[PDB]
Each structure stands twice: as structure tokens, then as C-alpha cells.
Design a protein around this ligand. Sequence first.
Ligand code: 78M
Ligand code: 78M
Ligand code: 78M
Ligand code: 78M
Length: 475
Amino acid sequence: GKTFFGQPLGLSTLFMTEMWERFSYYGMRAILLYYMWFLISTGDLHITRATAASIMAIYASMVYLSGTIGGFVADRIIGARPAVFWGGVLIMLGHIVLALPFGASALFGSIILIIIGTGFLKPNVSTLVGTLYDEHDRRRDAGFSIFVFGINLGAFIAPLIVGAAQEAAGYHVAFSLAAIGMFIGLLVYYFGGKKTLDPHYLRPTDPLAPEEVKPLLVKVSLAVAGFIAIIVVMNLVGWNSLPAYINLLTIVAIAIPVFYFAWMISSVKVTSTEHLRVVSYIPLFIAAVLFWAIEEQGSVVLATFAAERVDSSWFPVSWFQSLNPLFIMLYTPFFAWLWTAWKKNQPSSPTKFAVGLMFAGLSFLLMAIPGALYGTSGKVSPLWLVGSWALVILGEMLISPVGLSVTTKLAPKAFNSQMMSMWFLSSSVGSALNAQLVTLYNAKSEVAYFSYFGLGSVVLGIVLVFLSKRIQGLM
Ligand SMILES: CCCCCCC/C=C\CCCCCC(=O)OC[C@@H](O)CO
Ligand SMILES: CCCCCCC/C=C\CCCCCC(=O)OC[C@@H](O)CO
Ligand SMILES: CCCCCCC/C=C\CCCCCC(=O)OC[C@@H](O)CO
Ligand SMILES: CCCCCCC/C=C\CCCCCC(=O)OC[C@@H](O)CO
């Protein structure tokens, strides 16, 4: 019968829903940094550009960290389908706040709404995609491959459309276009989900038991009281600046995997065999952190280079952000044929982590060339950025599909659900690491910034190549 490229027609609803949410999110990311530059130039925002770059990095870090909790909220409390809807309302509200005739006072309110909203939506839309296929359906992998296609599709047209609207009608209209994009998504999701989505997912599939309610309430209350207490003593000591808070969220985002790691490597009930699998995974987790740190600097550091060091007079600078989802859509049909046809001697999944990290380092090493040859005073060809993005995404084609499968294969049965978080949390730690590194990038440190962090990523990819045989053997 009639399908959506061979899959049930319910996929088209979740295709549209996530395409328009990625449209709203990445359409905002393409102009949010430049919007902060504008507020700084008018004296309305009293921070430096290095701090504004840190905000962008720690913003993304909290979004991924929020994406590790929304799955628990839906599957236990509110339900997957209500989490996508109300998550989308919070995202729409976040963009509406920026569309209002406000300035810097609306930045923190808008950021919180999108952080909470994205955590409810992104994990539970992927969850609803799986619910379209009863088990044994081998169309599942092809359906998710089409789902991620709409993800990249929305991330591609958003910087082009939203960036052009900013040049024509200003920032407030451009931010309203992002809110409208989320509005189109909730329209197709609400009315489309009422026809093809299973009504069982209107409630939590694993609701709380009566004896589970009180301990969960105590657990979330102690974490809030402690986090509030940490903020209290900061202002008393005097560490009450915006870089001080960003450092706090940097520490709490990095301590979560560090505490989870020390919590896992120390337990006795795991015995020796599965204990080495956790130790051997540490070189893999740190490599994912370094890659996602480089990949997420495209919307921060590379966006700064595009506006200041590239002669892009005939088009909006924010259009460079479309290069990241463009190469993904171009690389996917090639790598889809590659991994299946390469039956002879396909490299191990740890090696793909190493080569993926080396290519992310080659992307930054490439960016050090124009500043060393021409200097940092003038403008260079826009082809330097399209070559940098081409390299870092080649590293993503090797790391992103293999990444989650690596953590699951090395995960002991007692750490499985927690090990899965370690993979998703590597994106939050990479952006948390960026919140400190992007401050070092400026006009006079361009060549050094790209050289040291680029070579350091290449060297650490060489080290993983050596350690690849030992880690694959444990699998
Ligand atoms: C449910 C619909 C949600 C979408 C709401 C869309 C809101 C429409 C318009 C408000 C934003 C445009 C206001 C433009 C403005 O005030 O600044 C003037 C202009 O020069 C700057 O762009
Ligand atoms: C997402 C809604 C806000 C949740 C904030 C976090 C507060 C912590 C736990 C939520 C309170 C528990 C509500 C669920 C509940 O009472 O279920 C009871 C029933 O299912 C079993 O007796
Ligand atoms: C599948 C693996 C892909 C690897 C691609 C490797 C590409 C090799 C060389 C690209 C040129 C290296 C950068 C040097 C360069 O572009 O300088 C040219 C510049 O001086 C022109 O004015
Ligand atoms: C961007 C992803 C992080 C990759 C870092 C890999 C860790 C290995 C080496 C890091 C370079 C250490 C020296 C860096 C440094 O001197 O900091 C200042 C530098 O930015 C000069 O402007």
C-alpha cells in the first residue's frame, strides 16, 4: 500500500514534527551569537564577545544534558506524546520571547524555555518513531534513517531562511520566524498524531509505583536544595559574575560523567572481566568529548571567523551554518553504500572513533593555514570554511553511527542504562569544554588556537589507533 518511502505513514508526522523543531532551534543558533554582538555594540548587553561565545557553548551543553532527562519524565510521569507537545510549546514560547521588543533581559528567560522544551521533545520524538514498528520489522533502521533526514533538512534551510529574514526585517522578525517554525511543527504533530499514533503513549508506559513517589521526590528535592545552596555561598564569597555562573554549569556538566565513571569503576558486584570494559571505554568517551567539542564550535568559533575573516559581502554570514547539515545529507547516501559493501576488512568501531577525531583535528589544522600565510588582518576565501566543515563532518560519519553501538557493546548488564547516558552526555561535556576554550579565540590568537587544539586532537586520535586493538578485543 501507500507508504512514506516504504515505512508506515505515521512516520511522515514525526518527520515533519522534528524537521520543524530543528528548523526553529538551528535557525536561532545561526543568528543568536550575532544578535548578542548587536546587543553588546549598543550597550544593552554588558558582556564581552568571549563571554557571549561562552554562553553559546554552555547553552548547547545544557540542551543535551536536558535531553538525558526528558526520556525519564515521559516514560514515567507525563507520557511520550504529551512530552512532545508541551515540549514544543516551551520551544515556541522561547522563540516568542526573543521576538518581543525586548533586549538582554529576555535572553535568560528564552534560554531556559528552550532548554526545558528541547529536553521534553527531542528524546521522545525518536521514542515515538520506534513505536511505529512492531518488533521484527526490519524497516526500522531505514525509517530512522529517513527520520534523521528530516532532522538535517530542517537544520539546512533554517540558517538560509532565518538568516535572510534577519537581513531584510531585523532580528525580532527573524526570531519570530523560528517561533512560527515550531508552530507549524505542533500543528502537524497534533492533528497528524491524532490519526496515526498509538493512543497508549498518551500516558506514561512505566508509571510510578506508590512506593516510588516519595523517594523520587526526596531525590529531586535534595539536588535542588544543594544546587541552590551552591549558588547562595557563591554570592556571599563574591563569585557572582556571569563567567562565574558559566563555570558552575561547566563543572556540574563535567562532574556528572566523572562521578558516574568513578561510581562504575569502583563497584565490586561487576567482577574483573566487565570492569576492564569500563576502563577501556574511557579512551572512547574522551574522544567523543573532543570531537563534539570541535563540531559544536562551528556555531561559535567558526561563526565568528565567518563574520570577521571571510569576504562574504554578497550573502548573510549566518548561511555558513547550513554547511554542517549540508555535508551530512551529502555524505549519508555514500556511507550507507560504503559500510554494507565493505564486507572484506571494515575497520573496528574504536578505529572509527580515532579516525573521526583526527579528521576533526584536521578541520582545525586547516583553519590555521590562512592566518599563517595571509595574516589575520584581511579576509580570506569562503572556501576555507567549506573545507573545514567538510573534514569535521567526515569525522562525524565515522563516530556518530558507531558511537552508541560501542557503548552498548562494552556496557556490563548492571551499567547498561547508565552507560547509554555516557554516550549522549559526551555532547554536553564537549560543549561544556567549549564554554572555557572559546574564550581563548580572538584575532591575535587565531593561528595558535587552531594549531594547538587541532594538533592535540590529531595526536589523541593517533593514541586511540594504538589502543584500538585492545578495546575491540574486549568486545
Ligand atoms: C502562534 C504564532 C506564534 C508566532 C508569533 C509571531 C509574532 C509576529 C510578529 C512579532 C515579531 C515581529 C515584530 C518586529 C518588531 O517588533 O521589530 C521591528 C522590526 O524592525 C525588527 O524586526
Ligand atoms: C514533569 C512534571 C513535574 C515533575 C517535577 C519533578 C517532581 C518529581 C516527581 C513528580 C511528582 C510525582 C507525580 C507522579 C505521581 O504522583 O504518580 C503517582 C501514581 O502514579 C502512583 O501512586
Ligand atoms: C576522504 C579523505 C579526504 C582527505 C582530503 C585531503 C585534501 C588534501 C589536500 C587539500 C589541500 C590542503 C590545504 C592546503 C590549501 O588548500 O592551500 C591552498 C591555498 O594556498 C590556495 O590559495
Ligand atoms: C578543541 C577540542 C579540544 C582538543 C584539545 C586536545 C588536547 C591536547 C592539546 C591541547 C593544547 C594544549 C595547549 C593549548 C594552549 O596553549 O592554550 C592556549 C592556546 O589557545 C593558545 O592560543
